[PDB]
Design a protein around this ligand. Structure first.
Ligand SMILES: [Mg+2]
Ligand SMILES: [Mg+2]
Ligand SMILES: [Mg+2]
Ligand SMILES: [Mg+2]
Ligand SMILES: [Mg+2]
Ligand SMILES: [Mg+2]
Ligand SMILES: [Mg+2]
Ligand SMILES: [Mg+2]
Ligand SMILES: [Mg+2]
Ligand SMILES: [Mg+2]
Ligand SMILES: [Mg+2]
Ligand SMILES: [Mg+2]
Ligand SMILES: [Mg+2]
Ligand SMILES: [Mg+2]
Ligand SMILES: [Mg+2]
Ligand SMILES: [Mg+2]
Ligand SMILES: [Mg+2]
Ligand SMILES: [Mg+2]
Ligand SMILES: [Mg+2]
Ligand SMILES: [Mg+2]
Ligand SMILES: [Mg+2]
Ligand SMILES: [Mg+2]
Ligand SMILES: [Mg+2]
Ligand SMILES: [Mg+2]
Ligand SMILES: [Mg+2]
Ligand SMILES: [Mg+2]
Ligand SMILES: [Mg+2]
Ligand SMILES: [Mg+2]
Ligand SMILES: [Mg+2]
Ligand SMILES: [Mg+2]
Ligand SMILES: [Mg+2]
Ligand SMILES: [Mg+2]
Ligand SMILES: [Mg+2]
Ligand SMILES: [Mg+2]
Ligand SMILES: [Mg+2]
Ligand SMILES: [Mg+2]
Ligand SMILES: [Mg+2]
Lengths: 67, 185, 62, 144
RNA sequence: GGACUUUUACUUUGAAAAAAUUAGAGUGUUCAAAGCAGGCGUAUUGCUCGAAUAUAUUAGCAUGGAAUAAUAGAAUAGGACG
RNA sequence: GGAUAGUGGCCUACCAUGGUUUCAACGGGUAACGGGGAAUAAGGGUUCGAUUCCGGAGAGGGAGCCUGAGAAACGGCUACCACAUCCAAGGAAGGCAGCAGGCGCGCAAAUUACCCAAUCCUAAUUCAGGGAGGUAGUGACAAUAAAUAACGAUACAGGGCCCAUUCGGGUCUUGUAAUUGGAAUGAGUACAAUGUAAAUACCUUAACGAGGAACAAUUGGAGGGCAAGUCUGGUGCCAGCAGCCGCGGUAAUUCCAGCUCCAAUAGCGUAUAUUAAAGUUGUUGCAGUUAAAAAGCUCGUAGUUGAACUUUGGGCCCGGUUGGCCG
């Protein structure tokens, strides 16, 4: 078999310099659990609609139904 | 919008489809080299045509012509390193009269026949396409390998495969077990 | 010319040839094995002749 | 002499006199005038598809003698009416009225083939299945 | 010593030029289509060849040639040279 | 002069009557984006190029403009034209020739999947974003490699060169099997590792995986052109076949089939187009008395073409290249 190899001067300058997927291959980094590109994007877009905090806007909303 | 991964085709078919002459000659080459189909003859028949043209052209240049020399010797040089062009037909005039079998001769398959190993070009095939051969450390299962000069004396059975050490196959090993669990105990 | 001629016997002969099933037979070798067969068979053993040699002669002259 | 000019600067005439005469060349003219798109029942397209109007029994030209079994088709793409040969034995029992079929040409360059007059197209499919398959019982005509 | 064709055509040789494709050299992708890689060694901190070349027949530019074919010039001398 | 970033009839004012054309202007067609390029291989040519790169253009049709360095921008706005969605009937909103997907059209073209790991772009910016791109999916578009069996044993025929008087017979190697023998291998399937962003496949590899109803290859053809049946059964100018010639009316080598045989074979056939064959577009390179074709005749303009002659001969220098001979 033939591959490719690296040996970093100190563990530190690896963790810095290595791509973060090989990091997790070794355990040297956590497998971040995220929402799929679609869920992400779709959230980005739902947000696109709102101007400001919106923590304001839900006051606008909540006002209308409590009377 | 990538880059066109290029390709070309390796064969050509005959203009007259039913020359029983050519059809006869072809079949001889099929059984006297243990071939699969016509395309295996076609391929080389194409191959050969491109060589003779290349030659043909250079032969129309002047001798001592820069181009003729670099690429006339080059042609010959390749045709020698393979077993097609003999040690002193090393001219361009001889590469023209270069015949077909001249190539087909140097097949791994025909070569495996040409030194023990097989006793039959058909045995030779089913041996090659089954990891039962190695050029150097390299296992090679293509019947059309084209064996080179300095490569010739390195075609031996594999480091794996029963015919070369390391285990028997699994049909032998299947038998050693059926003479075992039954008659044994 | 005439264009509405009879259609009543469409399929005449096909529907009236007696069906007969194909006999079984040992499989014929496919691939390189076949051209082997064909080679050694057509010219190496050399069978029937006439001064021209014959592929498919029905029950000879005799 | 040779009846054509030779002059070093006669390119003009030669260039032109040939262009002027490519026209007696049929295939060229057909190609240039777009006949294929204009007259022709198909678009020019290798194949067309239409609906079967009636079964026709066309009688063969001499010296032969038979009923050649054809179909009248309403080509879907331009509603041109064109009659088509159903090949093989009793395959006319495979196509019906209002049936939608695929027609193709006869290999004869738009000329008619053999002893069948006015027919220049063959029926290759009917109701989306092949004809050959229907005939060799590899498939069934879908249950209209 | 530079500049120099009356005015052209023609022809030579170059320049400025894209890559991919084409032709074509190198290279054992296990063969091949391909790819443009790769190769050597103490393989415990290395060394090392490459990634060429041909092709464009229009026109333009530069240049060697002046055969062929056109073209200009002294005839009321309103000619040429100094 | 005005306008422009700026030249310019770009626009205006005034002034002239000019500009293009048989060396084809102008107008028409184009099932026309231009080129790099593709197919076809004696050559010369013929045909194609929506489409991986360059350039142009457009974003349902048109016009208009804002912002900005840059847009006459459309995942910007304004209007008309054409479509057309939501609605509490007052009103509001959309522009897939981006990616997927749907309808329609048709002979004709794939998943509403994963990801920024690579390639590279953007921004305030190593970080964010990117249906650019990459990955897998569908995928017999084309292309490459090339399994579907291999080797013995036995008994006959004998290729047996012989010995040799004869069913006598040396002895390998062809040919045949309702006769046997063990070896081999991956298609698969699958611990693992590898591969990957995560997967998947390939490469590698444990445990498995070959004896016929299997791991069973097909497509077309068998009169000529053209390779291969005058064998059998069916039909009887019917059904049907046949690019073309032709086959079929009772002994069909051409239909329907069985058997066998041929050809190409993981591919083979059909249709349309095109190229070679085509010296049947002919410059190379055709034809024209009678096969298709010399205008009834002559003049004549464009066009094509157009006698000969002007430094020829002699004499030298310089450094070059494949061959004489030889080591
Ligand atoms: Mg006739
Ligand atoms: Mg050391
Ligand atoms: Mg010059
Ligand atoms: Mg200006
Ligand atoms: Mg002015
Ligand atoms: Mg006027
Ligand atoms: Mg027109
Ligand atoms: Mg167009
Ligand atoms: Mg075009
Ligand atoms: Mg284009
Ligand atoms: Mg063009
Ligand atoms: Mg179009
Ligand atoms: Mg635009
Ligand atoms: Mg649209
Ligand atoms: Mg901006
Ligand atoms: Mg716009
Ligand atoms: Mg859009
Ligand atoms: Mg845009
Ligand atoms: Mg889309
Ligand atoms: Mg849908
Ligand atoms: Mg269809
Ligand atoms: Mg398709
Ligand atoms: Mg990225
Ligand atoms: Mg990023
Ligand atoms: Mg930070
Ligand atoms: Mg199989
Ligand atoms: Mg088996
Ligand atoms: Mg068959
Ligand atoms: Mg038959
Ligand atoms: Mg034939
Ligand atoms: Mg024959
Ligand atoms: Mg019969
Ligand atoms: Mg010439
Ligand atoms: Mg002629
Ligand atoms: Mg005449
Ligand atoms: Mg006249
Ligand atoms: Mg002259």
């Amino acid at each position: 078999s033939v591959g490719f190899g690296l040996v970093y001067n100190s563990v530190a300058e690896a963790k810095k310099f290595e791509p973060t997927y090989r990091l997790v291959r070794y355990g040297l980094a956590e497998k971040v659990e995220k929402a799929s590109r679609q869920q992400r994007k779709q959230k980005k877009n739902r947000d696109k609609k709102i101007f400001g905090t919106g923590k304001r806007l839900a006051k606008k909303v909540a006002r209308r139904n409590a009377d | 919008p990538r880059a066109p991964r290029t390709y070309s085709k390796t064969y050509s078919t005959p203009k007259r489809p039913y020359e029983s002459s050519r059809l006869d000659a072809e079949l001889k080459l099929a059984g006297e080299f243990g071939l699969k189909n016509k395309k295996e003859i076609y391929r080389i028949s194409f191959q050969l045509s491109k060589i003779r043209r290349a030659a043909r052209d250079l032969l129309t240049r002047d001798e001592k012509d820069p181009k003729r020399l670099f690429e006339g010797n080059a042609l010959i040089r390749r045709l020698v390193r393979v077993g097609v062009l003999s040690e002193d037909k090393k001219k361009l005039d001889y590469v023209l009269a270069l015949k077909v079998e001249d190539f087909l001769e140097r097949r791994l398959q025909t070569q495996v026949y040409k030194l023990g190993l097989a006793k039959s070009v058909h045995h030779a095939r089913v041996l090659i396409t089954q990891r039962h051969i190695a050029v150097g450390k390299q296992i090679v299962n293509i019947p059309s390998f084209m064996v080179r000069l300095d490569s010739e004396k390195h075609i031996d059975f594999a480091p794996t495969s029963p015919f070369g050490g390391a285990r028997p196959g699994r049909v032998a090993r299947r038998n050693a077990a059926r003479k075992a669990e039954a008659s044994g105990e | 010319a005439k264009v509405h001629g009879s259609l009543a016997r469409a399929g005449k002969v096909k529907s009236q040839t007696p069906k007969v099933e194909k006999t079984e037979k040992p499989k014929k070798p496919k691939g390189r094995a076949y051209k082997r067969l064909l080679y050694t068979r057509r010219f190496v053993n050399v069978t029937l002749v006439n001064g021209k040699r014959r592929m498919n002669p029905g029950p000879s002259v005799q | 002499g040779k009846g054509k000019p030779r002059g070093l600067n006669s390119a003009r005439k030669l260039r032109v006199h040939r262009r002027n005469n490519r026209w007696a060349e049929n295939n060229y003219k057909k190609r240039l005038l777009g006949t294929a798109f204009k007259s022709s029942p198909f678009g020019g397209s290798s194949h067309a598809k239409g609906i079967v109007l009636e079964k026709l029994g066309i009688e063969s030209k001499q010296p032969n003698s038979a009923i050649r079994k054809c179909v009248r088709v309403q080509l879907i793409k331009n509603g041109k009416k064109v009659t088509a040969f159903v090949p093989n034995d009793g395959c006319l029992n495979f196509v019906d009225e209002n049936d939608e079929v695929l027609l193709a040409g006869f290999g004869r360059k738009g000329k008619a083939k053999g002893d069948i007059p006015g027919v220049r197209f063959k029926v290759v499919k009917v109701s989306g299945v092949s004809l050959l398959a229907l005939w060799k019982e590899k498939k069934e005509k879908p249950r209209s």
